[PDB]
Amino acid sequence: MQNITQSWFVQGMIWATTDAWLKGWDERNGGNLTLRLDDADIAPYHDNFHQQPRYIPLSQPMPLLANTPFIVTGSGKFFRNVQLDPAANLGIVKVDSDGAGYHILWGLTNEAVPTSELPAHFLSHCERIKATNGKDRVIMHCHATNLIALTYVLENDTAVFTRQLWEGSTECLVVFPDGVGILPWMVPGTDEIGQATAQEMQKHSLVLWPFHGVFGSGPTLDETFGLIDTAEKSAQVLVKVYSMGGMKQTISREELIALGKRFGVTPLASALAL
Amino acid sequence: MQNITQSWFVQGMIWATTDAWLKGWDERNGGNLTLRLDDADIAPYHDNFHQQPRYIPLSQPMPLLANTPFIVTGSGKFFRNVQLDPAANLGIVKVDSDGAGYHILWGLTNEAVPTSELPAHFLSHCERIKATNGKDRVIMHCHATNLIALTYVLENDTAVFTRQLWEGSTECLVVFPDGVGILPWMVPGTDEIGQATAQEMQKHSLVLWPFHGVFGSGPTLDETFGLIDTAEKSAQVLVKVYSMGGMKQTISREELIALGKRFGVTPLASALAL
Amino acid sequence: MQNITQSWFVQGMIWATTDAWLKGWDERNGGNLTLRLDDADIAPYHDNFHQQPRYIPLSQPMPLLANTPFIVTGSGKFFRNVQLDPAANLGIVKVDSDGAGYHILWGLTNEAVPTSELPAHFLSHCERIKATNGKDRVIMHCHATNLIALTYVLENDTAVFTRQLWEGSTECLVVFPDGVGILPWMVPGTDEIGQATAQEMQKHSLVLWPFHGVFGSGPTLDETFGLIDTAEKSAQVLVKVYSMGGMKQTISREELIALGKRFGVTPLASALAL
Amino acid sequence: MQNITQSWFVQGMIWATTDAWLKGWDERNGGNLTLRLDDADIAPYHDNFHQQPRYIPLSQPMPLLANTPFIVTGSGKFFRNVQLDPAANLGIVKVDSDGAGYHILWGLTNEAVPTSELPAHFLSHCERIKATNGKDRVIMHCHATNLIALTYVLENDTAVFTRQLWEGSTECLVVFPDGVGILPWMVPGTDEIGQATAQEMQKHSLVLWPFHGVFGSGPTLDETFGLIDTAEKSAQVLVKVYSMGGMKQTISREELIALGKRFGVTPLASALAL
Ligand SMILES: [Zn+2]
Ligand SMILES: [Zn+2]
Ligand SMILES: [Zn+2]
Ligand SMILES: [Zn+2]
Ligand SMILES: [Zn+2]
Ligand SMILES: [Zn+2]
Ligand SMILES: [Zn+2]
Ligand SMILES: [Zn+2]
Ligand SMILES: [Zn+2]
Ligand SMILES: [Zn+2]
Ligand SMILES: [Zn+2]
Ligand SMILES: [Zn+2]
């Protein structure tokens, strides 16, 4: 066999955090990542676990997550460093039988704790489980540069921002037909931002935090990264276009309608009506 | 000997898709790549082939491709992932004796299929074989960032866009004297876009899809990548120039004429007449 | 055991200089880095030391640094090259018992000397030791591209520049609540710039040199790099925003106040009053 | 011992071409590089040489280069590929006893030839040998993106362009006090451009070719790359500044004078007088 560091999920967390770091999305400790696992994923490795797993209570219980293991990035940890020492910067946590707290089964060495945003990641996992009949398994936050820049110049409105993003690369309507939900600026790490993000996650796989960054959900690390990368690539194109004095032409409503029909998706009505 | 993963063509596909990924041209599954092989390339490795190669019919037969093997990127596959698992993300296909379909000789594991754009890649291969007396072997699509951005600000016209690209780096006229053919925006993955792209490929080695990306043809992976990289580098320069308020000076018609004479190329007349 | 090149501190210097090089912050010999060590760090490796450590006097003695070892980048050395040959490009120096000079214990082969800016790094180390009760251990200088660009377009004033940086990413107020001190342009490598930078370091962990670059202080290589990376990422966002015609909206004073309260920091009053 | 591929000079050529490729300066075959060697460099490896070195005549003899070996990039070769197969993409050439031609001692396999710009590189080597009493050993050409972009917006005049570059990063006056000589646009690969570049090399270590790229000279690969990287980094800053609507403040003549005095350099008078 092998050590847990060579598992598909530890190697996956490494690749995702490194690639996000390399894109320029995760300065310092900016960003966090949680992946919902099955018991079968971690089972072969139980003797690599901490002998006496630390328990941390959850302020709000999440019975929908009872008995569920996750691999998570740590609080104050750098995406840059994950590849260098996965055990120091990542943890495997398991929510207990009534969803009242979790045990830290592996990693987060030297008394590290999960991302301060864990109970918020958990709330969004809950809404995404319901919204997708258990398909979604990942919540990813990063400081995607061009998407951030756009929040200073575009109206911070779901329909308006979504429509520009759709225009900025042909694939975007196909990739996120439900659009990108945009919150008002909120104090990060608060219960209130967690709740508001989870509420937006009911209707969208992508949520923007003006002047701060993006939140994405998806079934796998690759698909979730890909989702955020698609929105950020469109944002990159838009920044160049706006910098050159704006669109002389663009993808029309008629074209977006034809696109949604061909790919069997229902584009967000408000964004499409503009 | 060696396994097929170490062949020049599998290693070539890996390098090309990775480099395109690293340039920022291939977010998510954006992009696709097909390379026409000879029987001699794949022959040493036949016992590595799937035991019972899956057959897929072609909607339109292509007898010009009868008996021809290709290595191709898979549908829904990420350029990012090719280096990690070539067999999962790439396939070797061989068109049958009457060009009615192809067998999947190798790769595309777990029921993966070639790029949904395979019959379109095939149509362009056909036109490029005819246009170059069999020299061209590669069709490459990617989401080249600056070229995309320019399609929102420049007139989407072959002559006009080609002329700006020629101006944006001295080598461009020498590298693509036949210019870049620009289609109207079209729904991707359709028969209609495949046909229109193949028609443009009769007269140009590079074709642009407004608000979406670029298509290039060439004799080798390196030369085809190089061709697209040249156009995208010129586009990068132009974006910076337009962002700084536009050209105060540029390469003149007189200079472009002198350049084409020295290098023994015939610049596209309409682009040169501007 | 191991050679000194595999120590945490030599490997740390390698990663920090390489990453800064990869970010585009350290063309040629642009940039310098010094890390304050303990005797326990270098002790195991004393027999790897130069047999007869070269002594260099300090123009101004620094008794606060008596007996203190540092690992430092060399004068005229390239950040790019550190990874290739740490011993050629890095040195371990130890300040003597009265702070009158230092011995070169290791590295800086072929008669290389520490960064010409060593006595200035030392002055800032002194002010940062006092300002943080010995917590700070690193002084890092680099040519952070977007921060440089901003010094041609923003008022070069501590309060004004700090406030824009806070606005340019939500985390910035939390990461540098004391702000970024901005000096007038000064001739580099002079006693005068060393003194002025050290004076600014009394009140700020980050100091800008208009038309030149940034200086940061912190307790570890990672945290200091992270600090500079945070300011530069905000600057990158601001450059894009200014390029697109400026802020239509931004983080308000009210929001910054709420942010500082939640995170338990006191934002620089003058920057906050704007 | 070792094979020639592990020599300092083959490894140096690899690093220089790869790094230039990674910076985005060398799309396709854009760019070329020649390094003047001594007989002592190549001597240990003579039995690795081609058995019967191919001879190529020089159109104009260069007796100043008699008996001199060089390692060079090949014609039509990609900087990207050098790391993959140095022998295919690089050659060691040795100019014969009267400077009438050269033998290809090593590399350029499969009938490859040195950069079509070899006799031009050679002419500049000659002028740089004279200008520096034999210190300069490298001629490097690349398609440095931001420097190219600036040639569409700044006056293509030595004094004017040099002065902006000096302003764009404090170190530039110190690094190239003699300035950057700017030619008119010329047809590349011609005798005329070779001559004009060599003439500019009498007075400058850096020469710009509008709408095309840069040429640099220096004593080592690192120092020459560093020289070009410095000018390109300043150009990058200037592009951002011009994109944000231009300089509100900048490095003054008075400051540049003070800078040149401190560093013991004589700034180009015409650029300084502006
Ligand atoms: Zn965040
Ligand atoms: Zn067990
Ligand atoms: Zn919504
Ligand atoms: Zn596409
Ligand atoms: Zn067999
Ligand atoms: Zn056409
Ligand atoms: Zn500096
Ligand atoms: Zn000892
Ligand atoms: Zn201050
Ligand atoms: Zn060139
Ligand atoms: Zn011999
Ligand atoms: Zn001159």
Instruction: Output the 3-class SS for C222-257.
Output: HHHHHHHHHHHHHHHHHHHHHHCCCCCCCCCHHHHH
Side chain identity at residue A174, one-letter code: V
Q: Report in angstroms the alpha-carbon separations of C204 from A59, B159, C127, C134, C216.
A: 37, 56, 10, 15, 9
Q: D98: burial class by Cβ within 10 Å (0-12, 13-18, 19+)?
A: exposed
Q: Is D227 on the interface with C (CB under 8 A)?
A: yes
Closest CA to D150 of D232, D250, D32: D232
Q: Report in angstroms the alpha-carbon separations of A182 from A195, A197, C259.
A: 14, 9, 19
Edge to edge, the sheet with strand B54-57 lists B54-57, B101-107, B90-95, B69-73, B32-36, B138-142, B213-218, B206-209, B180-182
Q: Is D117 a known active-site residue?
A: yes
Task: Write down which chains contact chain A via at least 3 CB pairs under 8 A.
Answer: B, C
Task: Flag if C149 and D244 touch (Cβ within 8 Å).
Answer: yes
3-class SS at D8? helix
Cα of A4 vs centre of ligand 2, distance in Å, is 13
Question: How far does the CA of residue C173 sit from the closest CA of chain A (Å)?
Answer: 12
Report the run of H or E that residue C33 belongs to, with start and end.
Answer: strand C32-36
Question: How far does the CA of residue C223 sit from the closest CA of chain A (Å)?
Answer: 7
Task: Flag if B145 and A230 touch (Cβ within 8 Å).
Answer: no
Closest CA to D141 of D56, D16, D9: D16
CA separation for the pair D42, D32 (Å, rounded): 21
Q: Which residues in C lie closer than 8 A to residue D236 (C-beta atoms)?
A: 24, 145
A204 annotated to a ligand binding site = no
Give residues with Cβ within 8 angstroms of B134, minimum separation 6. none
3-class SS at B155? coil
- Lookup: tokens for D33: 């590089």
Report the b/e string of C114-136 with b at 16+ CB within 10 A.
bbebbbbbbbbbbbbbebeeeeb
**Best residue in B81, B145, B211 for a mutation probing chain A (most A CBs within 10 Å):** B211
3-state secondary structure chain A: CCCHHHCHHHHHHHHHHHHHHHHCCCCCCCCEEEEECCHHHHHHHHHHCCCCCEEEECCCCCHHHCCCEEEEEECCCCHHHCCCCHHHHEEEEEECCCCCEEEEEEECCCCCCECCCHHHHHHHHHHHHHHCCCCCCEEEEECCHHHHHHCCCCCCCHHHHHHHHHHCCCCHHHHCCCCEEECCCCCCCCHHHHHHHHHHHCCCCEEEECCCEEEEEECCHHHHHHHHHHHHHHHHHHHHHHHCCCCCCCCCHHHHHHHHHHHCCCCCHHHHHC
Task: Flag if B148 and A250 touch (Cβ within 8 Å).
Answer: no
CA separation for the pair A166, A158 (Å, rounded): 12
3-class SS at B265? coil
3-class SS at B191? helix
Q: Under a CB-based contact definition with an 8 Å cutoff, are residues B67 and B97 in contact? A: yes
How many Å is the Cα radius of gyration of chain B?
19
Task: Flag if D187 and B241 touch (Cβ within 8 Å).
Answer: no
Instruction: Note the residue count of chain A.
Output: 274
Q: Under a CB-based contact definition with an 8 Å cutoff, are residues D146 and D235 in contact? A: yes
3-class SS at B126? helix
Q: Which residues in B lie closer than 8 A to residue D185 (C-beta atoms)?
A: 170, 251, 255
CA separation for the pair C36, C224 (Å, rounded): 13
Q: How many CB atoms lie within 10 A of CB C267?
A: 24
CA separation for the pair B148, B171 (Å, rounded): 20
- Lookup: tokens for D224: 């020459």
CA separation for the pair B257, C70 (Å, rounded): 62
Residues linked to residue C140 through DSSP beta bridges, in sequence order: C33, C216
CA separation for the pair B150, B161 (Å, rounded): 9
Cα of B200 vs centre of ligand 6, distance in Å, is 5
Q: Is A258 on the interface with B (CB under 8 A)?
A: yes
3-class SS at C34? strand
The upper half-sphere exposure of residue B130, i.e. CA atoms within 13 Å in the direction of its Cβ, equals 16
- Chain D, nearest residue to B224 by Cα: D28
Backbone dihedral angles phi then psi of residue C17, each to the nearest 5 degrees: -70, -40
- Lookup: tokens for C24: 């585009």
What count of CB pairs under 8 Å joins A to C?
A: 80
Report the b/e string of A22-58 with b at 16+ CB within 10 A.
ebbbbbbbbbbbbbbbeeebbeebeebbeeeeeeeeb
CA separation for the pair B34, B91 (Å, rounded): 10
DSSP string covering D120-189 = HHHHHHHHHHHHTTT---EEEEE--HHHHHHTTTS---HHHHHHHHHHTSTTHHHH-TT-EEEPPP--TT
- Report the residue from C81, C156, C243 with minimal CB separation from D243: C243
Instruction: Note the residue count of chain B.
Output: 274
Q: Under a CB-based contact definition with an 8 Å cutoff, are residues A180 and A165 in contact? A: yes
Closest CA to B236 of B145, B170, B164: B145
Q: Which residues in C lie closer than 8 A to residue D243 (C-beta atoms)?
A: 239, 243
Closest CA to D28 of B214, B165, B169, B135: B169
Q: D176: burial class by Cβ within 10 Å (0-12, 13-18, 19+)?
A: buried
Q: How far is CA A200 from the centre of its chain?
A: 13
Task: Flag if B233 and D189 touch (Cβ within 8 Å).
Answer: no
Backbone dihedral angles phi then psi of residue B69, each to the nearest 5 degrees: -90, 150
- Report the residue from B169, B230, B241 with minimal CB separation from D153: B241
Task: Flag if A153 and C259 touch (Cβ within 8 Å).
Answer: no
Give residues with Cβ within 8 angstroms of B173, minimum separation 6. B166, B256, B259, B260, B263, B265, B267
- Chain B, nearest residue to A258 by Cα: B187
Q: Under a CB-based contact definition with an 8 Å cutoff, are residues B69 and B39 in contact? A: yes
- Lookup: tokens for B261: 């004479």
- Chain A, nearest residue to B187 by Cα: A259
Q: Is B83 on the interface with A (CB under 8 A)?
A: no
- Report the residue from C230, C237, C262 with minimal CB separation from A149: C237
- Report the residue from C28, C81, C185 with minimal CB separation from D255: C185
3-class SS at B224? helix
CA separation for the pair A111, B216 (Å, rounded): 54
Report the b/e string of D201-216 with b at 16+ CB within 10 A.
beebbbbbbbbbbbbb
Residues linked to residue D94 through DSSP beta bridges, in sequence order: D69, D103
Q: Is B79 on the interface with A (CB under 8 A)?
A: no
What count of CB pairs under 8 Å joins C to D?
A: 80
- Report the residue from B170, B240, B262 with minimal CB separation from D212: B170
Q: Is A14 on the interface with B (CB under 8 A)?
A: no
Task: Flag if A245 and B153 touch (Cβ within 8 Å).
Answer: yes
3-state secondary structure C35-61: EECCHHHHHHHHHHCCCCCEEEECCCC
Q: How many CB atoms lie within 10 A of CB C258?
A: 15
Cα of D83 vs centre of ligand 6, distance in Å, is 37
Method: X-ray
Side chain identity at residue A257, one-letter code: I
Q: Under a CB-based contact definition with an 8 Å cutoff, are residues D29 and D76 in contact? A: yes
Closest CA to A231 of A217, A247, A250: A217
**Best residue in B170, B175, B176, B247 for a mutation probing chain D (most D CBs within 10 Å):** B170
Side chain identity at residue B55, one-letter code: Y
State the Cα angle at A124 between A122 and A130, rounded to 5°: 105
List active site positions of A: 117
Task: Flag if D152 and B249 touch (Cβ within 8 Å).
Answer: yes
CA separation for the pair B88, B107 (Å, rounded): 6
- In chain C, the domains with their CATH numbers are 1-274 (3.40.225.10)
Name the packing angle between helices B158-167 and B221-243 (round to 10°).
Answer: 90
Strand D206-209, strand D180-182: pairing? parallel
Instruction: Note the residue count of chain C.
Output: 274
Assign 3-state DSSP to chain D and report helix, strand, coil percentages, each to 5.
45, 15, 40
Ligand nearest the Cα atom of residue D204: 12
The experimental resolution of this structure, in angstroms, equals: 2.0
Q: Which residues in B lie closer than 8 A to residue A19 (C-beta atoms)?
A: 80
Closest CA to B80 of B9, B19, B121: B19
CA separation for the pair D188, D149 (Å, rounded): 18
Task: Flag if A244 and B148 touch (Cβ within 8 Å).
Answer: no
CA separation for the pair C108, C142 (Å, rounded): 20
- Lookup: tokens for B115: 């790029």
**Best residue in B148, B209, B238 for a mutation probing chain A (most A CBs within 10 Å):** B148
Q: Report in angstroms the alpha-carbon separations of D215 from A32, B77, B239, C29, D90.
A: 45, 41, 23, 20, 19
**Best residue in B220, B249, B261 for a mutation probing chain D (most D CBs within 10 Å):** B249
Q: Under a CB-based contact definition with an 8 Å cutoff, are residues B158 and B136 in contact? A: no
- Report the residue from C30, C146, C242 with minimal CB separation from D171: C30
3-class SS at B181? strand
- Lookup: tokens for A5: 């560091």
DSSP string covering D60-110 = S--GGGTT-EEEEEBTT--GGGTTT-HHHHEEEEEE-TTSSEEEEEEE-TT
CA separation for the pair C241, A210 (Å, rounded): 13
